[PDB]
């Protein structure tokens, strides 16, 4: 069966810029087969191109596809507003399958993280859990990364964290982390501390506490 | 004007089994396919099944995720397409769509039959949202993340919405008052099968001692109401 490859997953572009999204099909795939779909938040996908290059009922001409055999490209030929959202490759040549979406977002200057730690609240403390907090703010592009340590030691297994959507005022991302221990876990252990990498930062940051200080 | 409409989702648990409809209005299957697509929280497009249109004599064609587990059928007498959905998984979770395409055509006068303008569009329903879950209704305990004057990178202060279940949570900042500065990420699905959601405010360091600030949560599945007052330790 055929997987669709996309390349890039983010595409970073001003409004007015030209944009030129690239599908791979595993194995060829005539030219009827082969479609384009857009998708906002929290909205079904829409059809843009199908056959490879003819536009659906209603679709902007600035939208095109072209390409054959293994290769695709969507063009958008001056970006507007509304058209930052995912774009899907989809080809219906052997069974039906999505290529896994590129982002086009929209490009700004590198904005470095601002970077916060919270301990676990004297709260949750009580209520018998432990979760130290980390905050990434306001940075650009999307690729900022967070490590936890505890007493120096790198943590595997136990955070996760999740990302905002872009900014609309100031097209920035912010992350935020948690590590989950026992609070037996917690009371073991004093130093804690989640670093911080971006491109925009001249140096990796860390941010600590001492339990109890 | 044509239009699908998805119904039957909820919470079930693995194992357990539901029934998808897709309703079409404006047309009919006589001629038009139908596809089910899903999208799991936060992850892109997988495509179900299809069947084929009443022409085509209905045949049907399901992913290999589901194969033996789903089975598209449909009821002609109520232009509706069913997906019966048997021993679900937890991976399973997602917004259920379906979605066909719509041909129309501008045949010319004075010519025959094979000459006509095209046109192309698809149709999606809205979606239905499908959770496969062993976990139990459960409210959030609410928490502060508490700001200082000598933490500052602005000072930032939040709360930790954890431990519920199931799906969602609002969050607002004094009432809804507030909104400059805040982020509210999205949930994250935890190990233990409950859901944790953050939210932060950037606020200046220098007035922490005068300003108030208040998480509003609501989880309505369990009744909880909460808000929690954010003060600096």
């Known amino acids: 069966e055929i997987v669709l490859t996309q390349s890039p997953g983010t595409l970073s572009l001003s409004p007015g810029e030209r944009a030129t999204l690239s599908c791979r099909a595993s194995?060829?795939?005539?030219?009827?087969?082969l479609a384009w779909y857009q998708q906002k938040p929290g909205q079904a996908p829409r059809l843009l191109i199908y056959?490879?290059?003819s536009r659906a009922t209603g679709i902007p001409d600035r939208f095109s596809g072209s390409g054959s055999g293994t290769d695709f490209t969507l063009t958008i030929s001056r970006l507007e507003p509304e058209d930052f959202a995912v774009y899907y490759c989809?080809?219906?040549?052997?069974?039906?399958?999505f290529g896994p979406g590129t982002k086009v977002d929209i490009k700004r200057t590198v904005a470095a993280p601002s970077v916060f730690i919270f301990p676990p609240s004297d709260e949750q403390l009580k209520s018998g859990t432990a979760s130290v907090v980390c905050l990434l703010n306001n940075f650009y592009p999307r690729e900022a990364k967070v490590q936890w340590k505890v007493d120096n030691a790198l943590q595997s297994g136990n955070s996760q964290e999740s990302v905002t959507e872009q900014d609309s005022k100031d097209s920035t991302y912010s992350l935020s982390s948690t590590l989950t221990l026992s609070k037996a876990d917690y009371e073991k252990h004093k130093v804690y501390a989640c670093e911080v990498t971006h491109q925009g930062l001249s140096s990796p940051v860390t941010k600590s506490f001492n339990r109890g200080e | 004007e044509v239009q699908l409409v998805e119904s039957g989702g909820g919470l079930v648990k693995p194992g357990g089994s539901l029934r998808l409809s897709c309703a079409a209005s404006?047309?009919?299957?006589?001629?038009?396919?139908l596809d089910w697509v899903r999208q799991a929280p936060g992850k892109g497009l997988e495509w179900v099944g299809r069947?084929?249109?009443?022409?085509?004599?209905?045949?049907?064609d399901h992913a290999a995720p589901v194969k033996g587990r789903f089975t598209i059928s449909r009821d002609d007498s109520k232009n509706t397409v069913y997906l019966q959905m048997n021993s679900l998984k937890i991976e399973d979770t997602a917004v259920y769509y379906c979605?066909?395409?719509?041909?129309?055509?501008?045949?010319?006068?004075?010519?025959?039959?094979?000459?006509?303008?095209?046109?192309?569009?698809?149709?999606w329903g809205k979606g239905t949202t499908v959770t496969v879950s062993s976990a139990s209704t459960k409210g959030p305990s609410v928490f502060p993340l508490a700001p200082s004057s000598k933490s500052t990178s602005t000072a930032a202060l939040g709360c930790l919405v954890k431990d519920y279940f199931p799906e969602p949570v609002t969050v607002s900042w004094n009432s809804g008052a507030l909104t400059s500065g805040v982020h509210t990420f999205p949930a994250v699905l935890q190990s233990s099968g409950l859901y944790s959601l953050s939210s932060v405010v950037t606020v200046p360091s220098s007035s922490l001692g005068t300003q108030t600030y208040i998480c509003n949560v609501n989880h309505k599945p369990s009744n909880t109401k909460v808000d929690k007052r954010v003060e600096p330790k």
């Open positions: 979605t066909t395409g719509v041909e129309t055509y501008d045949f010319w006068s004075g010519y025959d039959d094979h000459y006509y303008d095209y046109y192309f569009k698809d149709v």
């Open positions: 404006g047309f009919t299957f006589t001629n038009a396919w």
């Open positions: 989809q080809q219906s040549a052997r069974s039906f399958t």
């Open positions: 194995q060829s795939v005539s030219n009827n087969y």
């Open positions: 069947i084929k249109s009443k022409t085509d004599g209905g045949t049907t």
């Open positions: 056959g490879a290059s």
